[model samples]
Each structure stands twice: as structure tokens, then as C-alpha cells.
Target: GHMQPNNESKKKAVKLDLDLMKETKNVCTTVNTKLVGKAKSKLNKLEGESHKEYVAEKTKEIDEKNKKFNENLVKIEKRKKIKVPADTGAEVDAVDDGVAGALSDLSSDISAIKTLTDDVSEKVSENLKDDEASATEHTDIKEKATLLQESCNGIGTILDKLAEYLNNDTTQNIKKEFDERKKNLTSLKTKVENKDEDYVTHFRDMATEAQNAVGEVKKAIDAVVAHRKAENLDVDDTLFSNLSTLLDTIIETS
Candidate 1:
């Protein structure tokens, strides 16, 4: 009990630590809010220069807490993992491996892109005025947002299909069909220049990252395709077509 007898125990202890840390952090956050109320109460009782000095001190205190809170968040992220389970064999395993890697990354990118686009839409509607300029901005963002949604959907579909196709199915089916899939990887470069706020920039930045992720998955698939080609295996054209449609949607966002 002093330390740990095995790796499983150690892992359990680590997860327990993470759970405890999370709870403690939440408690501290609650206290942070309570402290703000306490400060306000104290302000109501004090006056003049003394009240001002007290307010300044509390401000500093709150800032310190806020900074620490942000640091803790980053720490948790650093410790988190995207661990995948191990399974499966041979040349086919290569396809599995590639798809596995891409699936993980693509899933993350899809979620992140969804969040970014959702936030951008919300923030844009909240900040923009009901005028011609705002109308133009909304229209542009709306078009891109739709594209982002459709592309994400198409990408997810293809990833799912790729995984299923890699199942009990064999290269014999691969021998039956052969198939083939953006410049959008660079379009975000011009889109984020001198934006009104980070909402737009943040959305664009994540979009760029999302595009890069899609590219990586595509590359992985292409590599697997090449491997199949070398082995005289056939591939369905739908996979490539889905990718093409997905890429086209993202590029249109530009």
C-alpha cells in the first residue's frame, strides 16, 4: 500500500489522483466565486480610499486565482491521453493501423471543428449589428459554417466506411475495383487576417488545423491504397468520392 504492487494498481492510483485533483479544483473554483461575493460584501461595509485599496487588493487576489485556475486546466490537458486499444495481423494490419491513427485524429478534429464553428456562429450573431455589413458577414460565415458541417459529416462517414471495409473483407474484393480524392489546406491563411476578434481567428485557426488533419487522414488512406496497389488489391471508388466531396465542401468554405 505504501506505493504500488503492480502496474494496474499504479494506474488505478493515478486515475484516483486525477479524480481527486478534479474535485479539488472544482471546490477551489467554488471558493473563488464565494470569495468574489465576500469581497463585494466587504466593499459595501467600507468606503472612500480604504474601500478602493481593498478593492485593488481583492482584484489582485482574484487575478492570482484566475491564473492558477488556467494553469491547472492546461496541466490536466497535458496529462490526458488519446489511448487506443491494441488488436489484430500482417499487411492488412497496415491498413488497420493507418485507419486507426486517422480515425483518432479525425474524430478529434471533427469535434473541435464543430465546436469552433458553433462558437463562431454564436459569437457572430451576438456581436454583429443588423445592417448591410453585418448581413454580408453573417452570409459569409453561414456559408462556411454549412460547408464545415457537411464536410465534417462526410469525413466521419468515410472514416466509418473505411473501418468497416477493413473488416473480414479481403484483398480479393480489393482486386475487383480500383479508385481514387484539396487546396483548402492553404485557404485559411488569408481568411484570418485582421479579423474583428479572436472568435473569427480562433475559428479559422481550428479550421486550418482541421484541414491539416483531413489531409493527414487522406494521406494515410492514400498510402494504404498504394500498399494495396503494390499487392494488386482492389479498392472501392465510393471512399475516394466521399473524400472528394468532403474536400470540395471544405475548399468552398474559402
Candidate 2:
């Protein structure tokens, strides 16, 4: 006996619905996974870049301090030949000893600064190289996000086509499925937007942290420079304060 045409048509419709449902599930799974992975990857990359910028700034500050310390050392060495007599007052001898100690301290400080600067520069260079690699990963993530958006659009089109193939009695069920898919797409888009915003916020925070770190280091270097300047003043005060009125008058004329 031959099968009825309507029965065969009904069976075909059922099979098509099952196939469409499977395709929809696959599309959703792919898009959702891609969206999550891409978002995380991009956020991490931006954070890495911000960290690199901070390190570079800190390295520059250390280099500057190293230069300043060297210059101060040159000034200290130039004045090292000035001598106090054995019979000079206790205050004068004390001043001479203080100058010698300061010169020694400055020499040690210059060596330490050079070592720190070299170490920091090397580390900063390594961080920048890592950041460059992370940047490429970030680009790949963006491309993946774009591809997911396209795939979602294609799924939407397929769902629309499936709705057209259903009978009037089953149209409501098909419409419900279509609406659910649309809602999922909307939610996925929202997630993408939020992820991007969060990425920017993370980068901004990292940059601010780096600036604060560098500022702290600079303040420390400034204090050291001030101390060195005070030492120089102490040296000059010892040499000139007890000079005779004849020397004072000569100084006044000059």
C-alpha cells in the first residue's frame, strides 16, 4: 500500500524542524563561546599594555636620578682639595669631616643608582616586548568578535526561513522559537558592549596606578637631591664663615 501524500509531507516537516533546531543550537553555542573568550582576551591585553607604560615611565625616572647623582659627585670631587689646618677650631674640623663623609656617601650612592637604573631599564624592555605580543592577541580577539556577530546574523536569517516553513497551527510555536533566538542575540550583543566598557576601565586604572608608582619614586629621588645640596652648603659655610674682614672686603669688591 502506498503512503498518503499528507503523511509524507507531515513527516518531512517534522524532520526539517528537528534539523533547524539542531542548527540553531549549534550557532548559539559557537557565538556565545567566542564572545566570552574574545572579551577576556582583549581585556587582558589592554591591561598588559598599561602595565608596560608604567614600567617605562619608572625606568626613565631612575635614569634621571642616576644622572643627577653623577653631576653632584663631580661637584663634590672638585671641592675635595680645600683643606683645614690642624689647629683649626673643633667646629672647623667637624665641618671638614662632615664634607669627607658626604663625598664618600655620594660616591656610593652614584654606584647604587647606576646599578638600579640598568636593572630597571632591562626589565622595562622585557615588559614592553611582552606587551607587544599581547597586542597581537588583542587584535585577534577583535576579529573573532566580528566573526561572531556575522555568524549570529546568519543564524537569525535561518530562523526566519524556518518560521516560513511551519503550518498555521504550528506558527505560534515557531514564532516563540524565533523570539527566543532574537532575545539571545540581543543579550549577546549587550554582553559584548559591557565587556568592551570593562576593558577600557581596566586599562585606565592600570595607567593611574603606574603614574602613582612613578610619582612616589620621583619624590624619593628629590629628597636625596635636596640632602646632597644641603651637604654642599655645609661645605661652603665651613670654608668662608670665619674669613678675616680683609677677605670679606675683597669678596665685597668682587
Candidate 3:
């Protein structure tokens, strides 16, 4: 059979992909470790690297960390995944996305903000695709976590921006709720990371906070959609909806 019918090859490829991902992730983790090492030399090496990277790259690192953390949580029970990125770049003010351009941009902004928010999961949450490992260099495993305190601050940064841009009473209320729920999330992360804490209970508490965050966002998006629609907005609701859903998935999955 041709490519489409080559199930065996495809299956092999799938397994190969797992190795490839691990291979690449190694590089990202290395680069992150390398940078953190150079930046914070002796004061604190391992855990310091992770916290430093969280403040730098922000999302992807935490996304992977949170997933890994949750995995550690369910290791006893077995189950969970924290998955969730993209273009227009994060540095510039070109923060535009979708139509209704303003809010569509805002919608994307919302989703982007979410990525920066509830992230902080499993393993070495890193970027492996573009980095290379040094035979002589080795980073500590402790560099794989994002401090709950830092994640909370990141959420605050996002909450302030969202409040700045969306002026409606609905958005203000949503921000209030989002902030409250985010605090709950951050607290769970703190407790879970401690060696003495029961990670499973902390994990469930995190999930509950994540669910609450998702609900709040959905509640606000209603006003977001309606206001834009009233203007005969030409934005892609599907795109925003998918983004929100993905954010929800990234926050809660695994």
C-alpha cells in the first residue's frame, strides 16, 4: 500500500516521534538550563534555573512543568496531560489576531494570556526543537519546576492587561473572578510542589481551580462575542472558541 495504507510504518513513525520529541526536548531543557546557569551562577543552580526560565520564556516551560507535575500527582492513580502556542510573536505590540480585529485580537490576547497564566506542569517543560546539548554540561532536575508564587504574579500581569483593554462591566467582573480563581490555582501549585504535601489532593485542587477559571472565561466570552457581533463584527468566533477550548484543555488535561 501507499503512504495512506502503510499502517505499520505509521505506527512505527508514531513511536519514533516519541523518541524524537524526547530528543528535542532535551535540547530545550539544556538551553534553558544553560541560560539559567549563566545567569544565576552559584547562588542556586537547579531550582533557580526553572524559576528563572519561567520568568523568561514563560508559557511553554510552565506548560510542560505543570503537565509533569500533574503526572507526578497521578503517578499513584495513573492519568492526566497538560497540553497547549503560536505566531504574531509575544514581544511586540502587534498583539492583533482574528477579525472584529480589536476584540478578535483581544480574543487571541485572552487565549495568549491564558497560556501565560495556568501554565507550569510536568517534566522539564522545555524547548527541544532548536537547541543542542553539551556533553560537558549538565543541568539539574530541580530546574524543571515553576514556582507557584511566580505563576501567580504572571497571572496578575495578564489580569491587569485584560482589565486595561476590556472596559465593560462584564469584563471587569470577569477579571475579578479570574484573579480569585487564579490565586486558588497558584496556591494548589505551591502545596503540590512541596515534598511533604499530598500531590494527589493538591492536583485535584488545582483541577478544580482550573475548571473554575475555564468557566469564568467562558462567561466573559459571551459578552466578548455579543459586543463584537452587535457591531456586525467580522471576526472568527470558531477560532476564538477553539482557542478558549484549547486553553481549557491545556489547563485541565492530564
State which candidate has the highest TM-score.
Answer: 3
Q: Lowest lDDT 10-mer window, candidate 3?
A: 76-85
Per-model RMSD to reference: 16.9, 37.0, 18.9
Instruction: Sort every candidate by TM-score, greatest first.
Output: 3, 1, 2
> Could you give candidate 1's per-residue lDDT for residues 97-155 as a string of tens digits?
13222323332333333333334344444444567445535444544543544454444
* Clashing residue pairs found in predicted model 1: 174-233, 174-234, 175-234
Candidate 2 residues 1-254, lDDT tens each? 13222333433433333333334334433433443344333334334565666545544644564465446444433322222232442221122234334434443443333334334334433444667644443443334334434444444444444444433334444445445544554444344344455433333333333233323322322332344344332223322222111112111100
Candidate 1 matches the true fold with a TM-score of: 0.33
Clashing pairs in 2: none
How much lDDT does candidate 3 score? Answer: 0.41
- TM-scores of the models, in the given order? 0.33, 0.25, 0.41
Query: lDDT per prediction?
Result: 0.41, 0.37, 0.41
The better-scoring model by lDDT among 2 and 3 is 3
